[PDB]
Design a protein around this motif. Structure first.
Motif, PDB file in Angstrom:
ATOM      1  N   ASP B  22      23.160  41.351 -38.834  1.00 56.31           N
ATOM      2  CA  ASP B  22      22.866  42.203 -37.686  1.00 56.31           C
ATOM      3  C   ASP B  22      24.153  42.758 -37.060  1.00 56.31           C
ATOM      4  O   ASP B  22      24.266  43.966 -36.833  1.00 56.31           O
ATOM      5  N   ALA B  30      19.607  41.935 -42.127  1.00 57.74           N
ATOM      6  CA  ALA B  30      19.306  41.268 -40.866  1.00 57.74           C
ATOM      7  C   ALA B  30      17.801  41.005 -40.766  1.00 57.74           C
ATOM      8  O   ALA B  30      17.380  39.871 -40.515  1.00 57.74           O
ATOM      9  N   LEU B  71      15.449  46.929 -35.001  1.00 62.88           N
ATOM     10  CA  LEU B  71      16.229  47.275 -36.208  1.00 62.88           C
ATOM     11  C   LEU B  71      15.468  48.148 -37.214  1.00 62.88           C
ATOM     12  O   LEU B  71      16.061  48.967 -37.910  1.00 62.88           O
TER      13      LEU B  71
END
Lengths: 11, 75
Positions: B22, B30, B71
Motif C-alpha cells: 500500500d 495491497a 484502493l
C-alpha cells in the motif's frame, strides 16, 4: 484478550 | 502453537504485506494481501465468535475492507 503485537492499521 | 495463534500470525503476515505494498503504491498487491488477511480474520471469527478477541478481528476486517474500497478506485 488482545493481539500483541497489534495488527497494522492501513495508511 | 494453537490454531488461534497460528491463524493470527498468518493474518498478521498478510496485513503487514498489504500495508507495505500500500505504502509503495502497489494497489493490486495491497488489495490481494488485505483480502487474504480478511479471509483469515473471518475464519478466526467463525472459530472464536464469542470470545473477547473477536471484536478486534471484526474491527480489522472492516478497516481492511474500507481500504480495499479506496484502493479499488485507483487502478
Amino acid at each position: 484478550r488482545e493481539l500483541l503485537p497489534e495488527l497494522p492499521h492501513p495508511p | 502453537m494453537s490454531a488461534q495463534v497460528m491463524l493470527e500470525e498468518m493474518a498478521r503476515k498478510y496485513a503487514i504485506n498489504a500495508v507495505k505494498a500500500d505504502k509503495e503504491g502497489n494497489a493490486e498487491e495491497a488489495i490481494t494481501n488485505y483480502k487474504k488477511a480478511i479471509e483469515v480474520l473471518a475464519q478466526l471469527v467463525s472459530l472464536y465468535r464469542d470470545g473477547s478477541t473477536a471484536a478486534i478481528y471484526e474491527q480489522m476486517i472492516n478497516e481492511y475492507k474500507r481500504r480495499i474500497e479506496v484502493l479499488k478506485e485507483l487502478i
